[PDB]
């Protein structure tokens, strides 16, 4: 986006390329080992992430440190951002104030952006269009064990509110879940969902399965 691009000086090799007009697509950003240390990169190549909608704050916790002279409180903020196609990121941010924590969490989210596979793999849609995920997938963080299953079109997101938010930002409209562990731990629940969505890429396939499951790696 031109707006941030003007104000932005890159500071990184990747940012130099982006500014220079090279690496014009976030797909060219990803699967190369590259190091993203710049939400400005992500905003340039994915401007819909700059939007208050398409941003989601998922948890705010007041955490305590003890000292002589009493309690010193910090704010942990779990935020997610995403383009409602196939890109989503998740970040934690800490601050002495909630607003600092929020902007930091969103920056780290844009840095932790990932690219996911979308499709249709349920026995009872077979629509070959990317409303769900193409195959069941699993993820974990802490005690939380999230198992996402493809669902039919119009089902909705059969998952807790955190997963609803993250999957909406990632463009998944329909899904079934089975969960284990402590889902009342929002951080680890969210990371488990996130890691499942990345395991969509970790899973292997055969040639024709792309066509039959409607597999889509980013935008459609």
């Amino acid at each position: 986006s031109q707006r941030v691009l003007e104000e932005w000086e890159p500071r990184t090799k990747l940012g130099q390329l982006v500014k220079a007009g090279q690496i014009t697509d976030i797909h060219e950003i990803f699967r190369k080992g590259y190091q993203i240390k710049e939400p400005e990169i992500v905003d340039v190549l994915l401007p819909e992430v700059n939007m208050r909608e398409n941003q989601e704050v998922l948890d705010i916790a007041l955490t305590v440190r003890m000292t002589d002279s009493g309690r010193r409180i910090r704010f942990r903020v779990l935020a997610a951002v995403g383009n409602r196609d196939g890109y989503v990121g998740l970040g934690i941010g800490h601050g002495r104030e909630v607003g600092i924590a929020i902007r930091k969490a969103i920056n780290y989210a844009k840095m932790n952006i990932i690219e996911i596979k979308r499709g249709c793999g349920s026995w009872e849609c077979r629509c070959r269009r990317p409303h769900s995920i193409p195959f069941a997938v699993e993820g974990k963080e802490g005690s939380v064990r999230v198992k996402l299953m493809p669902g039919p079109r119009g089902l909705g997101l059969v998952i807790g509110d955190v997963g609803k938010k993250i999957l909406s930002l990632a463009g998944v409209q329909d899904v079934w879940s089975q969960s284990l562990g402590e889902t009342r731990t929002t951080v680890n629940f969210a990371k488990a969902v996130f890691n499942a969505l990345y395991n969509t890429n970790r899973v292997a396939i055969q040639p024709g399965m792309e066509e039959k499951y409607g597999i889509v790696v980013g935008r459609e």
Binding site: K13, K32, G33, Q35, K37
Partner: protein
């Protein structure tokens, strides 16, 4: 067949260590009755040729060579002054590759660590970037996160000077910054510490 054989063996390149590694027994030629393993100079020579081609295809300033070890601190410095190859002899200064808020922030395209166990810092920062790692490895080195390996004593003043001298020569040869290799002028004694 460069640098015939006795210059290698005088530098002590074939000399390994009492410890071994299965990642490196491919290169280990034998073990002698004292418990010390010996590397194959033929493989050393081959891998040096390939490293030369590789780093020649790379851009000069994008090359970074690090050496915590002092015996390599000097010849890495000379390698840099010869090739344009971002020498880091001292301590790596954690954040050189990852924190853009350091003074000397470097985002290279390849890395020439002299010993991975001593340069574990640079290794993991390069890992995070996703750049290749060329490494000098002795019989006790693991090949984790090493995309090109060169067998070497990697603890000797000599043999470090010689390996870096050979690399510089082969890089310039493959860049055509020199014609036939004998047109190289620099001495190994210049690459060496000489205490």
């Amino acid at each position: 067949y460069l640098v015939p054989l006795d210059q290698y063996l005088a530098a002590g390149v074939h000399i390994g260590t009492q410890q071994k590694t299965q990642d490196m027994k491919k290169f280990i030629y034998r073990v002698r009755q004292d418990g010390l393993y010996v590397l194959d100079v033929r493989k050393t020579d081959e891998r040096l040729r390939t490293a030369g081609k590789f780093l020649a295809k790379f851009d000069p300033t994008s090359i970074l060579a690090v050496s915590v070890r002092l015996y390599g601190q000097k010849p890495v410095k000379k390698f840099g002054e010869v090739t344009g190859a971002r020498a880091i002899p001292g301590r790596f200064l954690p954040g050189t590759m990852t924190n853009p808020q350091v003074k000397n922030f470097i985002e290279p395209d390849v890395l020439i660590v002299t010993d991975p166990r001593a340069d574990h810092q640079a290794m993991k920062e390069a890992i995070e970037i996703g750049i290749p790692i060329v490494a000098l490895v002795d019989t006790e080195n693991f090949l984790s996160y090493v995309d090109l390996a060169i067998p070497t004593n990697n603890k000797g003043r000599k043999a470090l000077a010689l390996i870096y001298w050979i690399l510089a020569r082969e890089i310039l040869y493959n860049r055509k910054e020199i014609e036939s290799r004998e047109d190289f002028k620099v001495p190994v004694e210049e690459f060496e510490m000489r205490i």
